[PDB]
Amino acid sequence: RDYDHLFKLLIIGDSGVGKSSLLLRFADNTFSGSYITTIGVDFKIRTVEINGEKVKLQIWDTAGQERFRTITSTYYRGTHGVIVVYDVTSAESFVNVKRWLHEINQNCDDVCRILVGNKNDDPERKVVETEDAYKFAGQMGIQLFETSAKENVNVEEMFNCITELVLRAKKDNLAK
C-alpha cells in the first residue's frame, strides 16, 4: 500500500546477545514490547525512504535459538535477508553464529546476510576480538558490523547495510 518494496528479515542469535535491543532501535512500532516470552516469536516494522524509494521491512525473531547448534534451511524460506548476531563478550555466541553462517552458505546461499557483534561498548569484557570476527566475515564473503545497541553506535549503519543488500538483490534479480 504505502511503500514501494516490502522485505522480510530474520534476526538470529543466542538469547541475551541484544536482539530485542537492536530491534528497538529498528522499530517504527507504536507498541515496543516483545512477544518472545509470550508466543516465542516477535516481529517489528520499519519504513525508510532510500533514494526516493519507500521501503518497508519486517524483522522476525524467535525464542531460544541458542539451543540450535545449526539452524536449518526450512527456517529461512520466504526471507530476503538475515541479521546474524553474536555478543562480543560471549565466545559461545560467536561459535554458534559461525555454524549458522556455514549452513546458510551451503543451503541458503541466496539469502542476504550480515554478521553483527553486539555489545561492543566495554573493552575489558570483550572476548571476541575484531580481527577474528573480521577474518571469519571475509572467509564467508559477508560484512561485519560491531555495534552497541546500548549506546546506539553503528546500529543505523548496520541496518542500512542489510536493507541496501536486500534492495540490490531484488533489483539484480529483476534484471534477469
Binding site: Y35, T38, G40, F43, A63, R67, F68, T74
Partner: protein, 375 residues
C-alpha cells in the same frame, strides 16, 4: 529436543479466575506479582471474537522456547474462565483440578479452595505413579510422560482422532515432516488445541521446534504472517481476518469441515510404502484402540528415520558424530533417497540428532519406544 521444562520448581506458576477487556478476579498465589503474565492470561483465556466448549489449553513460550501450559475451563456462556499455568503437561490432572476449584468458587468454599491450591503449590513434584490426593477419597497418579498416549485416556489424542479424518491426519503429518507453515482452524477451543497438541505429539521422538501456538488470540493475528515454520491454532471467528491476509504457502486445516488446503504435494511425495502401512493401521479398529494410533505414527517415524543409527561415525579418541553423506546415500527406494536428503534440512530432525549425539557422547545409557521399534 523436547520443549517441556524438565525440572520445574513448582507444580504450577499461577492460578487465575478471569471474568468480563477481561480482568483477573482472583489469583493464587495471592502475592503473584508478574503483571505482564497476568495481563497476557486475560487475553489467552478468551482467544476469540465475542458473538466454544469448556476446556482448552493454550501455550506460552518462554525465552529458551520451553513451554508453559495454560489449562483452561470456560464458563457456561464464556462469561468467565478458570486457568492454571504450569510447566507440567498434565492435561487430565489440571482439567480435573479446575473443575474442583470452580465448584469451590461457586459454592463460595474459600477455605477448601485455598487449602487445595496451597497444598498443590507446596507439593514437591513426585515421581510417576505416586498417589496425589485431590480429596481423602480421590486421587490421581503422577503421569508417566514417557509412555505413548492412549485412547481414550489421553484427551488430546482422543479429541484429535475423533475430530480429524485419517486423510487429514496424514496431511498434517506430511506437512510437519516438511516443516510447513500450518494453520488449524476450529470452532471449538477444546478441539482446536487438542488437534495442535495431538498432531505434534505424533512426531515423537522428534518435536516441533519452531513457532508453536495451540491457540492464537486475535490481538496477535499478525503472527500468521511469520515466514519461519509454524504450527498455529485459531478459533473459527478469526478466519475471515486470516482469509484477509491472503497467506501464501500456508497449510490450512478447517477442522469443522475437515477441509485441508495445501499448495504442496507433501503427502504424495513421501515414501508410499511407509504411508500405506500407516494409513492401513489408522483405518483398523484393532490397531487404533488403546495406544494403537500413537503406535502407528511411531512405526512410521521409525521407518522414516531409523537408518540414522548407521550414520553414527564412532571413531575412538572421541567423539561420536553424525555423518550426513552416509545418511543420505543409503536407501531402499528413490522416494527414501529424497526423503533422507530433505530430512537433513529439518530442525525437528537436527534437534533429534544433536540430542542423541549429546546423549550418546555422554555415556548416560537410555531407552525409549522409538529405539525398541527400530530393533
Amino acid at each position: 529436543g523436547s520443549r517441556i521444562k524438565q525440572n520445574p520448581e513448582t507444580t504450577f506458576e499461577v492460578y487465575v479466575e478471569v471474568a468480563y477487556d477481561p480482568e483477573v478476579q482472583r489469583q493464587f498465589p495471592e502475592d503473584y506479582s508478574d503483571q505482564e503474565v497476568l495481563q497476557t492470561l486475560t487475553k489467552f483465556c478468551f482467544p476469540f471474537y465475542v458473538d466454544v466448549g469448556q476446556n482448552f489449553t493454550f501455550v506460552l513460550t518462554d525465552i529458551d522456547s520451553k513451554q508453559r501450559f495454560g489449562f483452561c475451563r470456560l464458563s457456561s456462556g464464556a462469561k468467565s474462565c478458570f486457568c492454571i499455568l504450569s510447566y507440567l503437561p498434565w492435561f487430565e490432572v489440571f482439567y480435573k483440578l479446575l473443575n474442583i476449584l470452580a465448584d469451590y468458587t461457586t459454592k463460595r468454599q474459600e477455605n477448601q479452595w485455598n487449602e487445595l491450591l496451597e497444598t498443590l503449590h507446596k507439593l514437591p513434584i513426585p515421581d510417576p505413579g505416586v498417589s496425589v490426593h485431590l480429596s481423602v477419597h480421590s486421587y490421581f497418579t503422577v503421569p508417566d510422560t514417557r509412555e505413548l498416549p492412549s485412547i481414550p485416556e489421553n484427551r488430546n489424542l482422543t479429541e484429535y482422532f475423533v475430530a480429524v479424518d485419517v486423510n487429514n491426519m496424514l496431511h498434517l503429518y506430511a506437512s510437519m515432516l516438511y516443516e510447513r507453515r500450518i494453520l488449524i482452524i476450529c470452532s471449538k477451543l477444546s478441539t482446536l488445541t487438542a488437534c495442535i497438541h495431538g498432531s505434534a505429539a505424533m512426531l515423537y521422538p522428534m518435536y516441533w521446534q519452531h513457532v508453536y501456538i495451540p491457540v492464537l488470540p486475535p490481538h496477535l493475528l499478525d503472527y500468521c504472517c511469520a515466514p519461519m515454520p509454524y504450527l498455529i491454532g485459531i478459533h473459527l471467528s478469526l478466519m475471515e481476518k486470516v482469509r484477509n491476509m491472503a497467506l501464501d504457502d500456508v497449510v490450512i486445516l478447517n477442522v469443522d469441515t475437515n477441509t485441508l488446503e495445501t499448495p504442496f504435494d507433501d503427502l504424495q511425495s513421501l515414501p508410499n510404502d511407509v504411508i500405506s502401512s500407516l494409513k492401513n493401521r489408522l483405518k483398523k479398529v484393532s490397531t487404533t484402540t488403546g495406544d494403537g494410533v500413537a503406535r502407528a505414527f511411531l512405526k512410521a517415524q521409525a521407518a522414516f528415520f531409523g537408518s540414522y543409527r548407521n550414520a553414527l561415525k564412532i571413531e575412538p579418541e572421541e567423539p561420536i558424530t553424525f555423518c550426513e553423506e552416509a545418511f543420505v546415500s543409503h536407501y531402499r527406494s528413490g522416494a527414501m533417497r529424497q526423503f533422507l536428503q530433505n530430512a537433513t534440512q529439518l530442525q525437528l530432525f537436527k534437534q533429534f540428532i544433536d540430542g542423541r549425539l549429546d546423549l550418546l557422547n555422554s555415556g548416560e545409557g537410555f531407552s525409549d519406544v522409538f529405539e525398541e521399534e527400530i530393533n
